[PDB]
From a paper:
Here, we elucidate the structure-function relationship of the transcription factor [name], a new member of the RNPP family, which positively controls competence for natural DNA transformation in streptococci. [name] is directly activated by the binding of its associated pheromone XIP, the mature form of the comX/sigX-inducing-peptide ComS. XIP-binding induces release of the sequestered HTH domain and [name] dimerization to allow DNA binding. Each TPR domain is composed of 11 α-helices forming 5 TPR motifs followed by an additional C-terminal α-helix α16 called CAP.
The crystal structure of the apo form of [name] from [name] has been determined at a resolution of 1.95 Å in the space group C 2 2 2 with 1 molecule per asymmetric unit. Assembly analysis of the crystal contacts using PDBePISA suggested that apo [name] is a monomer. Size Exclusion Chromatography combined to Multi Angle Laser Light Scattering (SEC-MALLS) analysis clearly established that apo [name] is a monomer in solution, with a measured molecular weight of 41 kDa for a calculated value of 36.5 kDa. In the absence of peptide, the HTH domain is sequestered by the TPR domain of the [name] monomer, generating a new interface of 874.9 Å2. Interestingly, this interface involves the HTH residues R35, R39 and R51, which have been shown to be directly implicated in DNA-binding. In the apo form of the protein, they form salt bridges with TPR-2 residues: R35 with E146 and D147, R39 with E117, and R51 with E118. The residue pair E117-E118, which belongs to the strongly conserved L115PEEE119 motif located in loop α7-α8 between TPR-1 and TPR-2, thus plays an important role in stabilizing the inactive apo form of the protein. Superimposition of the apo and bound forms of the [name] TPR domain (rmsd of 2.4 Å over 212 aligned Cα atoms) showed that the main difference concerns helix α9, which was broken in the dimeric complex and forms a more canonical TPR-2 motif in the apo structure. Interestingly, crystal contacts generate a dimerization interface similar to the dimeric bound form of the protein, with a conserved K246-E282 salt bridge. However, the small overall interface (537.9 Å2) and the poor calculated solvation free energy gain (ΔiG of -1.9 kcal.mol-1) characterizing this contact in the apo structure suggest that the monomer-dimer equilibrium is shifted toward the monomeric form in the absence of peptide and that the dimer would not be stable in the absence of crystal packing forces.
Residue numbers in the entry: 1 to 299
């Protein structure tokens, strides 16, 4: 018996004492789904502060009562390590990808017993995306993702964790000819409406979501709001000083000019801005990769 078992049993015992069904407790599932509540009551998942507060309100209990002497405090070292690994750029370098995956597993194992389901899923998302693991081969992660995405897709203000769930949604769309276009537009619009503050962790995750959006729009040949995506990516770069990512945004503007405007001159000029920027950064690997892209696009 661990922390998850003790809290889950307490919640289940009180829910059953009140003769309350899971469906009644969870209402429309916006804050807690039935499967999420089942996993909590079985001791498979720990409730986050937010889920625990919701459950206590529905049961007419205080969080203190539901906790008794149990302590769900997440050590600050967890967030320190999670933030460090989100700010750890791979640059598509396989050695750095492997190091980042090692960091993810380190934090996952060290804090497993004290993390709520949402945090563990966040780590599983990063591992699967970075290792290019098919979501179809990860069925337990997928079941948990499904309900978190049903909750995120109803929101208009996204936390860092929400943006990572959204990143895993974009991962489902990679290379997929068939997709729900109305859902994608809805998600796109809300991501573009997030405010950019001084949270570098948030901004990096937001930036990567914008790049995923841009890449899917090119793939689907759907360029509505594409310049909005470009402008928001540039604003994130400025707020968090993410200058090594700026050439990739100039390359996005080139694709827009080349594929949507069919303006080869302005596409070439945007490629040249990316190349000069990479060169001034003295990032030769990036510079040559962009020069190859310019030539491969016939410019």
């Amino acid at each position: 018996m661990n922390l998850k078992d003790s809290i889950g049993l307490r919640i289940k015992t009180e829910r059953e004492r009140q003769q309350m069904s899971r469906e009644v407790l969870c209402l429309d599932g916006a804050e807690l789904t039935v499967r999420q509540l089942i996993r909590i009551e079985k001791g498979e998942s720990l409730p986050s502060l937010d889920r625990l507060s919701y459950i206590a309100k529905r049961l007419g209990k205080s969080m203190t009562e539901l906790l008794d002497q149990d302590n769900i405090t997440i050590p600050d070292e967890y967030y320190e390590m999670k933030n460090r690994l989100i700010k750890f750029p791979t640059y598509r370098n396989p050695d750095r990808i492997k190091s980042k995956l090692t960091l993810i597993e380190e934090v996952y194992e060290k804090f497993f017993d004290i993390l709520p389901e949402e945090e563990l899923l966040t780590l599983d998302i990063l591992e699967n995306i970075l290792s290019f693991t098919s979501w179809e081969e990860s069925p337990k992660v997928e079941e948990i993702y499904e309900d978190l995405f049903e909750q995120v897709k109803r929101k208009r203000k996204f936390s860092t964790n929400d943006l990572l769930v959204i990143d895993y949604y974009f991962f489902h769309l990679y290379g997929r000819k068939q997709y729900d276009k109305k859902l994608f537009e809805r998600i796109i619009k809300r991501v573009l409406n997030q405010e950019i503050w001084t949270d570098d962790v948030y901004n990096i995750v937001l930036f990567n979501d914008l790049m995923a959006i841009a890449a899917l729009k090119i793939f689907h040949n759907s360029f509505s709001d594409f310049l909005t995506v470009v402008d928001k990516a540039l604003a994130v770069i400025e707020k968090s000083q993410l200058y090594s990512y700026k050439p990739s945004v100039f390359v996005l503007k080139a694709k827009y000019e080349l594929l949507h405007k069919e303006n080869k001159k302005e596409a070439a000029e945007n490629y040249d801005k990316a190349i000069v920027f990479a060169s001034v950064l003295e990032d030769s690997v990036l510079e040559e990769s962009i020069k190859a892209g310019k030539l491969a696009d016939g410019l």
